Amino acid sequence: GKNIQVVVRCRPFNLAERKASAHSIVECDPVRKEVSVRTGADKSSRKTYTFDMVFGASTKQIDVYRSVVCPILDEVIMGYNCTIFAYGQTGTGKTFTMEGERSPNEEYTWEEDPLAGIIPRTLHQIFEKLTDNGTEFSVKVSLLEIYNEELFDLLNPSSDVSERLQMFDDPRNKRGVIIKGLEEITVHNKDEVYQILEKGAAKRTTAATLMNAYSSRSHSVFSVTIHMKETTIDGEELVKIGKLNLVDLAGSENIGRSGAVDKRAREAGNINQSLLTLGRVITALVERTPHVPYRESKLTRILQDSLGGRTRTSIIATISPASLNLEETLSTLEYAHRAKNILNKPE
Ligand SMILES: Cc1ccc(C(=O)N(CCCN)[C@@H](c2oc3cc(Cl)ccc3c(=O)c2Cc2ccccc2)C(C)C)cc1
Ligand SMILES: Nc1ncnc2c1ncn2[C@@H]1O[C@H](COP(=O)(O)OP(=O)(O)O)[C@@H](O)[C@H]1O
Ligand SMILES: [Cl-]
Ligand SMILES: [Cl-]
Ligand SMILES: [Cl-]
Ligand SMILES: [Cl-]
Ligand SMILES: [Cl-]
Protein backbone atom coordinates (compact mmCIF):
# COMPACT_ATOMS: atom_id res chain seq x y z
CA GLY A 1 0.00 0.00 0.00
CA LYS A 2 2.49 2.51 1.39
CA ASN A 3 5.31 1.83 -1.07
CA ILE A 4 3.58 3.69 -3.88
CA GLN A 5 3.84 7.35 -2.90
CA VAL A 6 2.96 10.78 -4.30
CA VAL A 7 5.07 13.89 -3.78
CA VAL A 8 4.20 17.42 -4.88
CA ARG A 9 6.82 20.19 -4.78
CA CYS A 10 6.15 23.91 -4.34
CA ARG A 11 8.63 26.79 -4.33
CA PRO A 12 8.49 30.60 -4.23
CA PHE A 13 7.67 32.20 -7.58
CA ASN A 14 10.57 33.27 -9.78
CA LEU A 15 11.84 36.83 -9.26
CA ALA A 16 11.62 37.41 -13.02
CA GLU A 17 7.85 36.92 -12.73
CA ARG A 18 7.04 40.61 -12.33
CA LYS A 19 7.32 41.43 -16.03
CA ALA A 20 4.65 38.80 -16.64
CA SER A 21 2.54 40.32 -13.86
CA ALA A 22 1.53 36.83 -12.76
CA HIS A 23 0.03 36.65 -9.29
CA SER A 24 0.48 33.55 -7.19
CA ILE A 25 -2.10 32.71 -4.52
CA VAL A 26 -0.70 29.15 -4.40
CA GLU A 27 0.63 27.78 -1.11
CA CYS A 28 2.56 24.68 0.01
CA ASP A 29 2.44 23.32 3.59
CA PRO A 30 4.30 20.19 4.73
CA VAL A 31 2.95 19.94 8.30
CA ARG A 32 -0.68 20.12 7.23
CA LYS A 33 0.18 17.76 4.38
CA GLU A 34 -2.37 19.67 2.30
CA VAL A 35 -2.00 22.32 -0.41
CA SER A 36 -4.85 24.77 -1.03
CA VAL A 37 -5.10 27.44 -3.73
CA ARG A 38 -7.67 30.25 -3.87
CA THR A 39 -10.06 29.90 -6.80
CA GLY A 40 -10.35 33.67 -7.12
CA ALA A 41 -15.75 38.59 -5.57
CA ASP A 42 -15.77 34.79 -5.71
CA LYS A 43 -12.24 34.20 -4.42
CA SER A 44 -12.97 32.79 -0.97
CA SER A 45 -12.83 29.33 -2.52
CA ARG A 46 -9.57 27.50 -1.95
CA LYS A 47 -8.57 24.18 -3.50
CA THR A 48 -7.89 21.36 -1.04
CA TYR A 49 -5.31 18.71 -1.91
CA THR A 50 -3.96 15.81 0.18
CA PHE A 51 -0.61 14.05 -0.22
CA ASP A 52 1.44 11.98 2.21
CA MET A 53 4.43 14.24 1.54
CA VAL A 54 4.33 17.79 0.16
CA PHE A 55 7.47 19.83 -0.49
CA GLY A 56 7.54 23.55 0.27
CA ALA A 57 9.26 26.61 -1.17
CA SER A 58 11.56 26.71 1.84
CA THR A 59 12.37 23.01 1.60
CA LYS A 60 15.87 22.00 0.54
CA GLN A 61 16.63 19.85 -2.50
CA ILE A 62 18.38 17.44 -0.13
CA ASP A 63 15.26 17.02 2.01
CA VAL A 64 13.26 15.61 -0.89
CA TYR A 65 15.99 13.12 -1.77
CA ARG A 66 16.13 11.73 1.75
CA SER A 67 12.34 11.58 1.95
CA VAL A 68 11.77 9.66 -1.29
CA VAL A 69 15.21 8.43 -2.33
CA CYS A 70 17.16 7.81 0.88
CA PRO A 71 14.44 5.19 1.39
CA ILE A 72 14.11 3.62 -2.07
CA LEU A 73 17.83 2.96 -2.42
CA ASP A 74 18.01 0.59 0.52
CA GLU A 75 15.34 -1.59 -1.06
CA VAL A 76 16.99 -0.96 -4.43
CA ILE A 77 20.38 -1.39 -2.75
CA MET A 78 19.14 -4.79 -1.62
CA GLY A 79 18.49 -5.65 -5.26
CA TYR A 80 14.92 -4.62 -6.01
CA ASN A 81 13.91 -2.53 -9.02
CA CYS A 82 12.56 0.94 -8.20
CA THR A 83 11.30 3.87 -10.26
CA ILE A 84 11.41 7.56 -9.40
CA PHE A 85 9.95 10.01 -11.91
CA ALA A 86 9.04 13.69 -12.04
CA TYR A 87 5.96 14.77 -13.98
CA GLY A 88 4.10 18.05 -14.50
CA GLN A 89 4.43 21.29 -16.45
CA THR A 90 7.87 22.38 -17.63
CA GLY A 91 10.76 24.03 -15.77
CA THR A 92 9.58 23.21 -12.26
CA GLY A 93 13.12 22.18 -11.35
CA LYS A 94 12.62 18.55 -12.33
CA THR A 95 15.75 18.59 -14.48
CA PHE A 96 17.67 20.56 -11.89
CA THR A 97 16.69 17.93 -9.34
CA MET A 98 16.77 15.17 -11.96
CA GLU A 99 19.89 16.36 -13.80
CA GLY A 100 21.00 18.29 -10.73
CA GLU A 101 22.20 21.85 -10.33
CA ARG A 102 25.61 23.45 -9.83
CA SER A 103 26.12 26.33 -7.40
CA PRO A 104 27.02 29.63 -9.08
CA ASN A 105 30.71 30.58 -9.27
CA GLU A 106 33.58 28.33 -8.21
CA GLU A 107 32.08 25.60 -6.03
CA TYR A 108 32.68 22.58 -3.81
CA THR A 109 32.69 19.13 -5.34
CA TRP A 110 29.49 18.16 -7.09
CA GLU A 111 28.58 15.79 -4.31
CA GLU A 112 29.66 18.70 -2.13
CA ASP A 113 27.39 21.10 -4.02
CA PRO A 114 23.98 21.66 -2.38
CA LEU A 115 22.24 22.39 -5.70
CA ALA A 116 22.43 18.97 -7.35
CA GLY A 117 19.34 16.93 -8.15
CA ILE A 118 18.45 13.30 -7.52
CA ILE A 119 20.78 11.83 -10.13
CA PRO A 120 23.77 13.68 -8.73
CA ARG A 121 22.40 13.21 -5.21
CA THR A 122 21.13 9.72 -6.03
CA LEU A 123 24.44 8.85 -7.72
CA HIS A 124 26.62 10.16 -4.90
CA GLN A 125 25.11 7.76 -2.39
CA ILE A 126 25.69 4.46 -4.18
CA PHE A 127 29.49 4.47 -4.22
CA GLU A 128 29.89 5.76 -0.66
CA LYS A 129 27.17 3.52 0.77
CA LEU A 130 28.70 0.44 -0.86
CA THR A 131 32.15 1.24 0.52
CA ASP A 132 30.72 1.08 4.03
CA ASN A 133 28.92 -2.12 3.06
CA GLY A 134 32.11 -3.50 1.53
CA THR A 135 30.22 -5.78 -0.84
CA GLU A 136 31.73 -6.18 -4.31
CA PHE A 137 29.69 -4.18 -6.82
CA SER A 138 29.53 -3.40 -10.54
CA VAL A 139 27.78 -0.35 -12.00
CA LYS A 140 25.93 0.04 -15.29
CA VAL A 141 24.48 3.39 -16.41
CA SER A 142 22.05 3.98 -19.29
CA LEU A 143 20.16 7.01 -20.66
CA LEU A 144 17.07 7.19 -22.89
CA GLU A 145 15.10 9.85 -24.77
CA ILE A 146 11.43 9.58 -25.68
CA TYR A 147 10.12 10.87 -28.97
CA ASN A 148 6.87 9.47 -30.29
CA GLU A 149 7.52 6.26 -32.23
CA GLU A 150 11.26 6.57 -31.64
CA LEU A 151 13.95 5.73 -29.07
CA PHE A 152 17.47 7.10 -28.65
CA ASP A 153 20.50 6.35 -26.48
CA LEU A 154 22.26 9.36 -24.96
CA LEU A 155 25.48 7.64 -23.93
CA ASN A 156 26.71 6.79 -27.42
CA PRO A 157 26.61 8.94 -30.54
CA SER A 158 28.73 6.20 -32.12
CA SER A 159 27.30 3.84 -34.72
CA ASP A 160 24.67 6.52 -35.30
CA VAL A 161 24.70 10.14 -36.44
CA SER A 162 21.24 10.41 -34.89
CA GLU A 163 18.55 7.88 -35.83
CA ARG A 164 15.42 6.41 -34.20
CA LEU A 165 15.67 2.86 -32.82
CA GLN A 166 13.11 0.03 -32.82
CA MET A 167 12.21 -1.90 -29.65
CA PHE A 168 11.89 -5.69 -29.42
CA ASP A 169 10.04 -7.83 -26.87
CA ASP A 170 11.78 -10.92 -25.46
CA PRO A 171 10.35 -14.45 -25.71
CA ARG A 172 12.25 -15.78 -22.69
CA ASN A 173 10.40 -13.22 -20.57
CA LYS A 174 6.88 -12.27 -21.65
CA ARG A 175 7.08 -9.06 -19.61
CA GLY A 176 10.58 -8.23 -20.84
CA VAL A 177 11.42 -5.90 -23.71
CA ILE A 178 14.82 -5.95 -25.41
CA ILE A 179 16.43 -3.16 -27.43
CA LYS A 180 19.38 -3.94 -29.69
CA GLY A 181 22.56 -1.93 -29.40
CA LEU A 182 21.06 -0.31 -26.34
CA GLU A 183 24.06 1.34 -24.76
CA GLU A 184 24.66 0.82 -21.09
CA ILE A 185 28.28 0.85 -20.03
CA THR A 186 28.96 -0.24 -16.48
CA VAL A 187 30.93 2.40 -14.61
CA HIS A 188 34.55 1.45 -14.05
CA ASN A 189 35.04 4.46 -11.80
CA LYS A 190 32.51 6.57 -9.88
CA ASP A 191 34.67 9.64 -10.46
CA GLU A 192 34.79 8.57 -14.12
CA VAL A 193 31.05 9.15 -14.53
CA TYR A 194 31.29 12.89 -15.11
CA GLN A 195 33.46 12.47 -18.18
CA ILE A 196 31.13 9.72 -19.38
CA LEU A 197 28.19 11.77 -18.08
CA GLU A 198 29.29 14.92 -19.90
CA LYS A 199 28.41 13.40 -23.28
CA GLY A 200 24.78 12.87 -22.31
CA ALA A 201 24.15 16.59 -21.90
CA ALA A 202 25.83 17.58 -25.17
CA LYS A 203 24.12 15.01 -27.40
CA ARG A 204 20.67 15.61 -25.90
CA THR A 205 21.33 19.36 -25.69
CA THR A 206 22.34 19.82 -29.35
CA ALA A 207 19.47 17.85 -30.88
CA ALA A 208 16.53 19.09 -28.80
CA THR A 209 14.67 20.90 -31.59
CA LEU A 210 12.47 19.20 -34.21
CA MET A 211 12.59 18.05 -31.55
CA ASN A 212 11.43 21.53 -30.62
CA ALA A 213 10.01 19.79 -27.53
CA TYR A 214 13.26 18.75 -25.85
CA SER A 215 13.30 18.78 -22.07
CA SER A 216 9.78 20.22 -22.15
CA ARG A 217 8.29 17.53 -24.40
CA SER A 218 10.79 14.71 -23.79
CA HIS A 219 10.67 12.51 -20.70
CA SER A 220 14.29 11.47 -21.03
CA VAL A 221 15.07 8.39 -18.94
CA PHE A 222 18.35 7.69 -17.18
CA SER A 223 18.68 4.27 -15.55
CA VAL A 224 21.32 2.88 -13.21
CA THR A 225 21.80 -0.87 -12.78
CA ILE A 226 23.87 -2.36 -9.96
CA HIS A 227 25.48 -5.77 -9.58
CA MET A 228 26.54 -6.64 -6.05
CA LYS A 229 28.57 -9.50 -4.57
CA GLU A 230 29.34 -9.42 -0.84
CA THR A 231 31.31 -11.89 1.28
CA THR A 232 30.99 -13.06 4.89
CA ILE A 233 33.26 -14.41 7.62
CA ASP A 234 30.50 -16.96 7.96
CA GLY A 235 30.39 -16.34 4.22
CA GLU A 236 30.72 -17.15 1.55
CA GLU A 237 29.54 -14.91 -1.28
CA LEU A 238 26.12 -13.35 -1.84
CA VAL A 239 24.91 -11.93 -5.16
CA LYS A 240 22.34 -9.13 -5.42
CA ILE A 241 21.12 -6.93 -8.28
CA GLY A 242 19.84 -3.37 -7.93
CA LYS A 243 18.11 -1.32 -10.62
CA LEU A 244 17.17 2.33 -10.19
CA ASN A 245 15.33 4.40 -12.78
CA LEU A 246 15.34 8.21 -12.78
CA VAL A 247 13.33 10.10 -15.41
CA ASP A 248 12.03 13.50 -16.56
CA LEU A 249 8.62 14.19 -18.10
CA ALA A 250 6.59 16.60 -20.25
CA GLY A 251 4.56 19.39 -18.64
CA SER A 252 1.35 18.47 -16.82
CA GLU A 253 -0.65 21.48 -18.04
CA ASN A 254 -2.25 19.43 -20.83
CA ILE A 255 -4.08 16.96 -18.57
CA GLY A 256 -7.75 17.68 -17.92
CA ARG A 257 -9.31 18.25 -14.54
CA SER A 258 -11.89 15.52 -13.96
CA GLY A 259 -15.06 16.36 -15.87
CA ALA A 260 -13.08 19.32 -17.14
CA VAL A 261 -14.14 21.40 -20.09
CA ASP A 262 -11.29 19.33 -21.49
CA LYS A 263 -10.06 16.15 -19.83
CA ARG A 264 -9.62 13.44 -22.44
CA ALA A 265 -9.63 16.01 -25.23
CA ARG A 266 -7.24 18.31 -23.37
CA GLU A 267 -5.10 15.29 -22.46
CA ALA A 268 -5.95 13.49 -25.71
CA GLY A 269 -3.37 12.69 -28.39
CA ASN A 270 -0.40 10.65 -29.57
CA ILE A 271 1.98 12.88 -27.61
CA ASN A 272 -0.61 12.69 -24.83
CA GLN A 273 -0.34 8.91 -24.52
CA SER A 274 2.79 8.56 -22.40
CA LEU A 275 1.27 10.63 -19.62
CA LEU A 276 -2.14 9.04 -20.14
CA THR A 277 -0.68 5.55 -20.40
CA LEU A 278 1.17 6.15 -17.13
CA GLY A 279 -1.92 7.19 -15.19
CA ARG A 280 -3.88 4.11 -16.19
CA VAL A 281 -0.83 1.91 -15.71
CA ILE A 282 0.12 3.72 -12.50
CA THR A 283 -3.51 4.21 -11.49
CA ALA A 284 -4.31 0.57 -12.24
CA LEU A 285 -1.47 -0.66 -10.03
CA VAL A 286 -2.80 1.26 -7.02
CA GLU A 287 -6.23 -0.26 -7.61
CA ARG A 288 -4.95 -3.80 -8.19
CA THR A 289 -6.89 -4.15 -11.47
CA PRO A 290 -6.36 -7.38 -13.43
CA HIS A 291 -5.46 -5.70 -16.73
CA VAL A 292 -2.92 -2.92 -16.88
CA PRO A 293 -2.30 -1.12 -20.18
CA TYR A 294 1.47 -0.83 -19.78
CA ARG A 295 1.66 -1.97 -23.41
CA GLU A 296 0.17 1.17 -24.97
CA SER A 297 3.11 3.44 -24.13
CA LYS A 298 6.68 2.54 -25.06
CA LEU A 299 8.06 4.05 -21.85
CA THR A 300 5.51 2.08 -19.82
CA ARG A 301 6.45 -1.22 -21.47
CA ILE A 302 10.15 -0.83 -20.66
CA LEU A 303 9.36 0.10 -17.05
CA GLN A 304 7.24 -3.01 -16.51
CA ASP A 305 9.96 -5.23 -15.07
CA SER A 306 10.93 -2.80 -12.32
CA LEU A 307 7.27 -2.13 -11.59
CA GLY A 308 6.34 -5.78 -12.18
CA GLY A 309 9.08 -7.30 -10.05
CA ARG A 310 8.72 -6.56 -6.36
CA THR A 311 9.39 -2.82 -6.31
CA ARG A 312 8.81 0.58 -4.69
CA THR A 313 7.58 3.53 -6.74
CA SER A 314 7.39 7.21 -5.85
CA ILE A 315 5.34 9.61 -7.98
CA ILE A 316 6.24 13.30 -8.11
CA ALA A 317 4.27 16.38 -9.22
CA THR A 318 5.79 19.86 -9.62
CA ILE A 319 3.85 23.14 -9.62
CA SER A 320 4.28 26.90 -10.07
CA PRO A 321 2.37 29.35 -7.86
CA ALA A 322 2.41 32.23 -10.32
CA SER A 323 -0.73 33.41 -12.11
CA LEU A 324 0.83 33.35 -15.58
CA ASN A 325 0.30 29.62 -16.14
CA LEU A 326 -3.19 28.46 -15.16
CA GLU A 327 -3.06 25.15 -17.03
CA GLU A 328 0.11 23.58 -15.62
CA THR A 329 -0.95 23.59 -11.97
CA LEU A 330 -4.38 22.05 -12.60
CA SER A 331 -3.03 19.30 -14.85
CA THR A 332 -0.46 18.34 -12.23
CA LEU A 333 -3.13 18.37 -9.51
CA GLU A 334 -5.59 16.28 -11.50
CA TYR A 335 -2.82 13.88 -12.46
CA ALA A 336 -1.60 13.58 -8.88
CA HIS A 337 -5.10 13.26 -7.46
CA ARG A 338 -6.20 10.86 -10.16
CA ALA A 339 -2.98 8.85 -10.00
CA LYS A 340 -3.08 8.66 -6.22
CA ASN A 341 -6.34 8.63 -4.28
CA ILE A 342 -6.29 10.04 -0.76
CA LEU A 343 -9.01 11.34 1.54
CA ASN A 344 -8.74 15.09 1.92
CA LYS A 345 -8.09 16.22 5.47
CA PRO A 346 -10.66 18.78 6.64
CA GLU A 347 -9.54 21.81 8.65
C1 LIG B 1 25.24 19.95 -8.28
C2 LIG B 1 24.86 20.03 -9.82
C3 LIG B 1 23.59 19.64 -10.25
C4 LIG B 1 23.26 19.70 -11.62
C5 LIG B 1 24.20 20.16 -12.55
C6 LIG B 1 23.86 20.23 -14.02
O1 LIG B 1 23.32 21.26 -14.45
N1 LIG B 1 24.14 19.11 -14.95
C7 LIG B 1 23.77 19.25 -16.39
C8 LIG B 1 22.34 18.89 -16.80
C9 LIG B 1 21.24 19.86 -16.45
N2 LIG B 1 21.03 20.17 -14.99
C10 LIG B 1 24.78 17.89 -14.41
C11 LIG B 1 24.56 16.70 -15.34
O2 LIG B 1 25.03 16.80 -16.56
C12 LIG B 1 24.90 15.80 -17.52
C13 LIG B 1 25.45 15.99 -18.83
C14 LIG B 1 25.32 14.96 -19.81
CL1 LIG B 1 25.98 15.18 -21.39
C15 LIG B 1 24.65 13.75 -19.49
C16 LIG B 1 24.11 13.56 -18.20
C17 LIG B 1 24.24 14.60 -17.21
C18 LIG B 1 23.68 14.42 -15.86
O3 LIG B 1 23.02 13.26 -15.51
C19 LIG B 1 23.85 15.50 -14.90
C20 LIG B 1 23.26 15.32 -13.48
C21 LIG B 1 24.26 15.67 -12.38
C22 LIG B 1 25.07 14.70 -11.72
C23 LIG B 1 25.98 15.10 -10.71
C24 LIG B 1 26.09 16.48 -10.35
C25 LIG B 1 25.29 17.43 -11.00
C26 LIG B 1 24.38 17.02 -12.02
C27 LIG B 1 26.22 18.08 -14.12
C28 LIG B 1 27.07 16.79 -14.40
C29 LIG B 1 26.90 19.40 -14.69
C30 LIG B 1 25.46 20.54 -12.12
C31 LIG B 1 25.80 20.48 -10.75
N1 LIG C 1 14.11 26.01 -5.96
C1 LIG C 1 14.68 26.70 -6.99
N2 LIG C 1 15.35 27.86 -6.76
C2 LIG C 1 15.93 28.56 -7.74
N3 LIG C 1 15.90 28.19 -9.03
C3 LIG C 1 15.26 27.06 -9.40
C4 LIG C 1 14.60 26.22 -8.39
N4 LIG C 1 14.06 25.18 -9.06
C5 LIG C 1 14.35 25.34 -10.38
N5 LIG C 1 15.07 26.46 -10.56
C6 LIG C 1 15.62 27.01 -11.82
O1 LIG C 1 14.88 26.51 -12.92
C7 LIG C 1 15.76 26.07 -13.95
C8 LIG C 1 15.58 24.57 -14.18
O2 LIG C 1 14.46 24.20 -14.99
P1 LIG C 1 14.72 23.01 -16.03
O3 LIG C 1 15.81 22.22 -15.35
O4 LIG C 1 15.00 23.60 -17.39
O5 LIG C 1 13.37 22.11 -16.09
P2 LIG C 1 12.73 21.39 -17.41
O6 LIG C 1 13.82 20.57 -18.05
O7 LIG C 1 11.61 20.57 -16.82
O8 LIG C 1 12.26 22.52 -18.29
C9 LIG C 1 17.18 26.34 -13.49
O9 LIG C 1 17.72 27.53 -14.08
C10 LIG C 1 17.06 26.55 -12.00
O10 LIG C 1 18.04 27.51 -11.60
CL1 LIG D 1 3.04 27.20 -2.88
CL1 LIG E 1 1.72 24.62 -3.25
CL1 LIG F 1 17.99 7.71 5.31
CL1 LIG G 1 19.17 3.82 5.26
CL1 LIG H 1 5.62 -6.65 -27.31
UniProtKB/Swiss-Prot annotation:
ATP binds at residues 88-95. Residues 3-342 form the Kinesin motor domain. It is found in: Cytoplasm; Cytoplasm, Cytoskeleton, Spindle pole. The modification N6-acetyllysine is found at residue 129. Interacts with the thyroid hormone receptor in the presence of thyroid hormone. Component of a large chromatin remodeling complex, at least composed of MYSM1, PCAF, RBM10 and KIF11/TRIP5. Interacts (via C-terminus) with the kinase NEK6 in both interphase and mitosis. Interacts with RARRES1 and AGBL2. Interacts with TPX2. It is linked to Microcephaly with or without chorioretinopathy, lymphedema, or impaired intellectual development: An autosomal dominant disorder that involves an overlapping but variable spectrum of central nervous system and ocular developmental anomalies. Microcephaly ranges from mild to severe and is often associated with mild to moderate developmental delay and a characteristic facial phenotype with upslanting palpebral fissures, broad nose with rounded tip, long philtrum with thin upper lip, prominent chin, and prominent ears. This is Kinesin-like protein KIF11. The chain holds residues 16 to 364 of 1056 of the full protein.
